[PDB]
Design a binder for this molecule. Structure first.
Ligand SMILES: Nc1ncnc2c1ncn2[C@H]1C[C@H](O)[C@@H](COP(=O)(O)NP(=O)(O)OP(=O)(O)O)O1
Ligand SMILES: [Mn+2]
Ligand SMILES: [Mn+2]
Ligand code: NA
Ligand code: NA
Length: 327
DNA sequence: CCGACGTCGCATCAGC
DNA sequence: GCTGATGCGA
DNA sequence: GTCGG
């Protein structure tokens, strides 16, 4: 499937998805529309009718109708209408700021605050996360080339090892799947002193060192096991300075680490496929553990896992390299 | 017909 | 001030 | 909005 193969349809369904989530606050309709858009995005034929589309899992009667209207007229009346709607289009737009969700966007728009300009001159109505999201609005919508991601990985692994050479850190997500660009950086961290049965300062010392070398520039949230923040590569010579990027760091106990690495490497679809087989095979897999069921359906204790491969073994699937986990 | 549709860590609000 | 709820991003 | 028990 190629981009404008059914691109008009999948663009329409994505726009519908966003208004459901951000304006109508109907999260399940949001996910319904995205599921339809994903299945249609992978359909290897130009759709000729709604009835043709309805055969796909996730496409039902209402979306088939909408496809029929789009195919016949090149538009959807409802979508055209809500686009022109000042209140709804503004609510939907403001949720593009990190930290402004459907509820905050509604409240802002209720009181006349409708644009980034408006947000810019209303700082004291913004919490800390929202101010950062506003400050880096443009940067957070950029993608990260693998080359910068590699440079980012160099800094992270170097500084973590410098704090304590017994730390184990892994950059997961799309990067680990070998993608040529990434939306953010996902770091999983563990340390031999930290297990499930098991200082409450392990994550802090890593964050502090990355701030010290001026890699981490801002903090969205930070607790004992999860850091969410902002980072930036140092500027070259007198060159164009780099965009600020989103980075997460998760501290995970040693015995949960490789379940963590598997899960947070993804992809989405791959995690789903693998989880249901997974079930087929008499095992339950979440981000933390793999557990057996259980002649009744009663989960026994978590099984020992000391590498990704172990999990593949348990469910008798041949190991998949991260490179091959798009689904 | 009608409920499920992942779950959870952290920041902050609502209520006591 | 403490506890539970809500919003948010993932 | 779609699915399925
Ligand atoms: N809904 C989900 N279901 C199962 N696993 C999920 C998940 N969402 C996240 N994951 C676990 C697996 C998701 O792949 C992953 C990392 O989450 P991201 O950073 O949101 N997605 P990625 O890094 O692949 O793409 P990008 O370059 O745009 O950042 O974490
Ligand atoms: Mn990612
Ligand atoms: Mn991420
Ligand atoms: Na269908
Ligand atoms: Na937002």
């Amino acid at each position: 499937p190629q981009e404008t193969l059914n691109g008009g349809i999948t663009d329409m369904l994505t726009e519908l998805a966003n208004f459901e989530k951000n304006v109508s606050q109907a999260i399940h309709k949001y996910n319904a529309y995205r599921k339809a858009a994903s299945v249609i995005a992978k359909y290897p034929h130009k759709i000729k009718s709604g009835a043709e589309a309805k055969k796909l899992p996730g496409v039902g009667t209402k979306i088939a109708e909408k496809i029929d209207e789009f195919l016949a007229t090149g538009k959807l009346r409802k979508l055209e209408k809500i686009r022109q709607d000042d209140t709804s289009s503004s609510i939907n737009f403001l949720t593009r700021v990190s930290g402004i969700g459907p509820s905050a966007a509604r409240k802002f728009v209720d009181e006349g605050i409708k644009t980034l300009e408006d947000l810019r001159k209303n700082e004291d109505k913004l919490n800390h996360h929202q101010r950062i999201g506003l400050k880096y609005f443009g940067d957070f919508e950029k993608r990260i080339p693998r080359e910068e991601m590699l440079q980012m990985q160099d800094i992270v692994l170097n500084e973590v090892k410098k704090v304590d050479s017994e730390y184990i850190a892994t950059v997961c997500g799309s990067f680990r799947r070998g993608a040529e660009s990434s939306g953010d950086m996902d770091v999983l961290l563990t340390h031999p002193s930290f297990t499930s049965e098991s200082q409450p300062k392990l994550l802090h010392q890593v964050v502090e060192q990355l701030q010290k070398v001026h890699f981490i520039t801002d903090t969205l949230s930070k607790g004992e096991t999860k850091f969410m923040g902002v980072c930036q590569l140092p500027s070259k010579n007198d060159e164009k300075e780099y965009p600020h990027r989103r980075i997460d760091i998760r501290l995970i106990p040693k015995d949960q680490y490789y379940c963590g690495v598997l899960y947070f490497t993804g992809s989405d679809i791959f995690n789903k496929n693998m989880r249901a087989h997974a079930l087929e095979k008499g095992f339950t897999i979440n981000e933390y553990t793999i557990r057996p069921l259980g002649v009744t359906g009663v989960a026994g204790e978590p099984l020992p896992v000391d590498s990704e491969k172990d999990i593949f073994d348990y469910i008798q699937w041949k190991y998949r390299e991260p490179k091959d986990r798009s689904e």
